[PDB]
């Protein structure tokens, strides 16, 4: 017999357990050939879309989620490479740190605070759509600095929010033992997606 409590500390663990792998492969992906290697504007908004994908009523498996986290952490290497490559190793660390106090932060409030956020499910919904939208524009014809630095201000809310409000809803809403995989993918969708919108804001911020 469960408690909310276990369940919730499940999914944090999982969630933690996915960061390292992720972390793992992010170190791999740096032998990956330059022939291999996907264009910058692709893997940005791969990522928003693959947020949305995921956060399906579907229940998946931990091989899946663990697998995810290890290639998509191989994959999203060349953004890292490139915005360090603009602004100096230095910002990938400052970019962490960021998503780290805020994930911490809005995560904590969200897990314990009374309301129930899920009135906002539409809002968040709507707004990875347009954050979508944008991505796919930007393959086909190129943001400037202005425009991405605004775009990455955008994502970086829109995702602060899921943080705080999937926390909650993994509090209030039904959430059982098998779900926790899932929970722990969205999860990790919320903070590499953070990631990569700070990063892009600070790595263009520092030239």
């Keep these: 017999h469960e408690s909310k409590q276990s369940i919730m500390q499940r999914i944090l663990t999982v969630f933690v357990f996915t960061l390292l792998i992720a972390t793992v492969g992010l170190f791999i992906g740096q ?14 908004v791969a990522m928003i879309i693959l947020a949305f994908w995921m956060r399906r009523r579907k229940a998946v ?18 953004i890292v490479s490139h915005y360090a490559s603009i602004a100096g190793a230095y910002v990938v660390l400052e970019a962490f740190g960021s998503t780290f106090v805020i ?17 906002l499910w539409s809002f968040l919904l709507v707004a990875v759509l347009a954050l979508a939208v944008v ?15 605004a775009y990455s201000v955008i994502g970086t809310i829109v995702f602060s929010l899921y943080i705080l409000y999937d926390l909650n ?13 899932v929970m722990a993918l969205s999860l990790y969708l919320d903070f590499i997606n953070l990631f990569i919108n700070l990063l892009r804001f600070f790595g263009i911020l520092s030239s």
Excluded at 169 to 181: C, F, G, N, V
């Design 135 to 149: 991505g796919i524009f930007n393959i086909f014809s190129p943001l400037n600095s202005a425009a991405m630095m």
């Design 103 to 119: 994930f911490a932060v809005l995560g904590t409030i969200g897990a314990k605070m009374k309301k129930d956020l899920s009135f």
């Design 61 to 78: 498996g931990y091989a899946f989620v663990y697998t995810f986290a290890f290639v998509s952490g191989i994959t999203l290497f060349p």
């Design 31 to 44: 032998f990956v050939p330059v022939a291999l290697m996907l264009p910058l504007s692709i893997l940005e």
């Design 169 to 181: 809803q993994i509090k209030h809403r039904h959430i059982t033992e098998d779900l926790i995989p």
